[PDB]
Amino acid sequence: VPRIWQGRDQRTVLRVQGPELISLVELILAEAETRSQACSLIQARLPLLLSCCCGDDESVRKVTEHLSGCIQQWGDSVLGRRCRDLLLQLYLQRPELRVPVPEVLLHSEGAASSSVCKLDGLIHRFITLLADTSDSRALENRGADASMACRKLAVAHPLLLLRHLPMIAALLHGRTHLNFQEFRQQNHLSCFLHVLGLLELLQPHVFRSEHQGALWDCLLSFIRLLLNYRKSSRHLAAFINKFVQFIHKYITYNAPAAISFLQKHADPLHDLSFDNSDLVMLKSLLAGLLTAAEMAPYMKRLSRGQTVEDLLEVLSDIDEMSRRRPEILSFFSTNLQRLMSSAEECCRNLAFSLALRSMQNSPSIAAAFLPTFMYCLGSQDFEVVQTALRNLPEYALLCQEHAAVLLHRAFLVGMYGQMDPSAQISEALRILHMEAVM
Amino acid sequence: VDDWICEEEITGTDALLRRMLLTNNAKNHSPKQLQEAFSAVPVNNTQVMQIIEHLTLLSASELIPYAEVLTSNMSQLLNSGVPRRILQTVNKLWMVLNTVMPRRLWVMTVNALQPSIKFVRQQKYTQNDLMIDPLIVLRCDQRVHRCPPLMDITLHMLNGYLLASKAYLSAHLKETEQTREELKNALLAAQDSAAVQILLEICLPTEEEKADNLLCNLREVQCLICCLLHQMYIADPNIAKLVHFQGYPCELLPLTVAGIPSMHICLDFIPELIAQPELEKQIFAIQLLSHLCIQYALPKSLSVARLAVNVMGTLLTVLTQAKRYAFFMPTLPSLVSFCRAFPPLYEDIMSLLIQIGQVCASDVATQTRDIDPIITRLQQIKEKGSMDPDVQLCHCIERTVIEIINMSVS
């Protein structure tokens, strides 16, 4: 009504309870069913739903669970499909709700058509920011934070990234042709490694139609880069190993897309196979279509380790293997959850470093370190608190869903204690603000 | 200009309807017929509605015989259950009459909106009484404060008599003089600012209203008052500066910052308002600045936010115990607003926040407390009252810290 808005400048909110909001979404579904006998009307009525939710998390979650129930009860009815449609639109508009994504939404196809999202501008900012890998080492560590933050966002909220796959395709199209020596001095191969890790995380939701087209473009860029360094391909053995791991997963989930991509561009692949005889894996791939047993003495020594010398030596050994083989740290997670609470300084610092490396490789397991991390924050040993505060922004960025309580605890120990966590807490706040809102 | 611009042609639709709807002897709807329809004790809102809905087709000249019957009866319209259609139509007729007989209409409409405490309730205000003191317009009935058409009438009369007083005092000053200029200007400025303050207090929700904000008569009244204050501030920004130096309830700040587009000029005197020795002027400056920053995120807005954080961190070490509590309880919720608007303030905001937190924790440790927040060092979130001030201020510091962190993570 204009009388309510008289005088507003119109340049950059109704309260309703639970059951009324449920009746409202049922009425929107009734509208959708009456019109279907398009997504335009259901998108048109969406701002009314948001104007009645007023951004309340409780209302959003209640609507979400009611829609999940409606999808389950209605099976795969037309109205059930419309329930999925407005549920995915609601997830787009309010992704702050960190509910894990049901498979019914993964099977939904309408997410990759024309739509509106709230966080797309932020993740777009993230990937263009990470792409500018200039020479300043402070900026290089900032780019590293960007890459691992995108890793965590990929594992946590995949679908928002999946609408940013042509984004990464374009980002990699730019830098492929440039020569090898300038490739290493301007530090662009790290960006390739980062986005490779991203895409390795993003599976198997990275394997639908529009995703398939963006992947095809990205893989054309990848093989163009590979053929661009046929005379200097022998330093990137681990990168090509990650590449063929991606290839194995690709043929595993979507075999026909990989077959179509390889057969359409069979001549560059056979050219790379012939030109570089050292590529055993490529030839084998084209023709065809560790564990506790090793770590056991080390975790034995770590568990039955009382002196600082034994802990130091076994932790240095685990450190060197993890530098070779970062995947091995998941086995030791429980042991050095306890060793990073230890009173010894260097041993605790090493346990912290290895734990952070562990959960940076695997952004899912960082939540398991939460109770021991804020135990370290709350510990009466001041050195433990100091080293936890040192590692606070990295872990908070690795946690996000618990970065609220983490930084609140950091502030409380800062103010009731005498330490000043303002630098660390402010850096963490800056980074996760760039994560969340702007 | 509003009383003049309404005369302007939109299409001439009303000319067509006057031509077509007025012929079938409808002029029999005499003013006394309307008065009989009004004075009937079952009211019969259908009859009065019919009469005035015929009256809209009359030109402004022939509506003049109907002026008294629809002004004098308008106090009856304040009663509950009177449909919005009659109030809007009476508003339209009053706006039409305002174009031909404005002075007589205003004088005889002020008298029609007295609270009716007495038998006549002093139905004797004249042009001169309202010109010496336009605030009589706001001494009207309690009930028009939530009657948006009648509120619009009152605002038109108030604006008119503010200007009329401005002229009248100049005329009388010239007559008597045959210094006083400063006294005249101060009187006009104080009178205008008092009008603004009374209007802002109308916008406040009374305790009866305490018992959905957007859809209420309160919100319509707030929009009307905001439009009027916008006109006043455009006309004389010194009035805006004076009103904010006086201050008003901080509860009105989101309303008056959102609804009045000319409040970005406040950013040009927030530094002067901060410099005032009064603590309450400083607190109001911080709160007003926080709301402006959340509205206008400009480079000068950030500069004044930096100045506010600096001044708030400066007087943290100037204030005593009681003054620290008094200053930092209202100004600490402004920090989440600064952090919303300006991410580059995070380092300064949290350094200031940790400083205030350490000061308040030290103060808590000095005396025995009922709550002892220090040993609550590891409590969890308290998402959302006789405690002592120091523990209250500690909890306030924590609360703004969770609001900041929640905002940054959402």
């Binding site: 400048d9 340049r11 | 455009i234 920004p237 805006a240 587009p261 400009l298």
Partner: peptide
């Protein structure tokens, strides 16, 4: 000026 928003398009004489 109170009559123009700070983000309004500036007038160049």
């Amino acid at each position: 000026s109170p009559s123009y928003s700070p983000t309004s398009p500036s007038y160049s004489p």
